[PDB]
Amino acid sequence: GFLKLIEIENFKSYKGRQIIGPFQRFTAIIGPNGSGKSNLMDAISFVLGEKTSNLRVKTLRDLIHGAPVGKPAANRAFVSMVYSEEGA
DNA sequence: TTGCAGTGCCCACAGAGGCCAGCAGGGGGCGCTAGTGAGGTGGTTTTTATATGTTTTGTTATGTATTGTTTATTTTCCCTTTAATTTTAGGATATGAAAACAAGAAT
Numbered sequence: 001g002f003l004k005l006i007e008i009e010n011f012k013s014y015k016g017r018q019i020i021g022p023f024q025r026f027t028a029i030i031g032p033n034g035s036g037k038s039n040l041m042d043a044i045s046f047v048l049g050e051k052t053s054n055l056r057v058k059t060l061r062d063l064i065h066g067a068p069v070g071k072p073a074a075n076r077a078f079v080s081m082v083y084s085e086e087g088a
Numbered sequence: 089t090t091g092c093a094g095t096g097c098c099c100a101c102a103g104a105g106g107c108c109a110g111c112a113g114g115g116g117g118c119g120c121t122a123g124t125g126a127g128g129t130g131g132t133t134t135t136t137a138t139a140t141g142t143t144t145t146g147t148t149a150t151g152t153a154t155t156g157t158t159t160a161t162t163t164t165c166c167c168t169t170t171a172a173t174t175t176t177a178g179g180a181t182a183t184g185a186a187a188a189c190a191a192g193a194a195t
């Protein structure tokens with residue numbers, strides 16, 4: 001089928017658990033500069049798995065919320081997707 | 089002797105014509121002068137002409153500037169040869185990141 005929606009925890013300006021909306025056949029993510037939007041794609045690649053450098057980040061302990069400043073949100077992060085396919 | 093018919097003489101006063109002064113006619117020759125007219129001489133200027141001085145024009149010589157000339161040092165186009173310099177593996181490093189182990193903590 002396709003990807004229904006994405007769930008993030010303590011990752012790239014995403015405090016706590018927030019349910020991102022369900023994804024239709026063609027949606028879009030729009031916002032001004034520095035709004036924290038490419039990080040959604042970074043999480044998509046992350047749950048798919050890829051080396052840290054292409055996520056404009058090193059050592060993979062900087063990916064937690066608040067880590068680039070220097071004060072992490074916690075030592076604990078979830079990311080989770082739900083794939084929706086036909087046959088219910 | 090006389091009357092009558094006819095003659096002689098003396099005068100005189102118009103009568104007449106030469107004499108004469110007066111006076112007017114024509115044209116000959118001289119005394120004198122006003123007023124031009126022309127001709128000759130002298131003065132003046134003047135005008136042409138001639139000679140001298142100054143300046144203007146023409147010719148000659150020297151210096152400067154322009155054009156040309158064979159050098160002559162660029163200069164620049166064209167070779168063959170290096171001296172950096174770049175590119176391609178090939179090995180080694182490093183720093184990360186899972187992975188396993190060991191250490192609290194809970195059940």
Ligand SMILES: Nc1ncnc2c1ncn2[C@@H]1O[C@H](COP(=O)(O)OP(=O)(O)O)[C@@H](O)[C@H]1O
Nearest residue numbers: 012013034035036037038039064065066067068
């Ligand atoms: N964990 C984080 N917490 C807070 N701010 C962050 C965090 N990671 C990145 N940022 C900052 O958020 C800003 C938004 O950029 P980013 O999140 O990368 O996405 P986008 O490029 O779509 O704006 C950047 O200045 C980035 O440095």
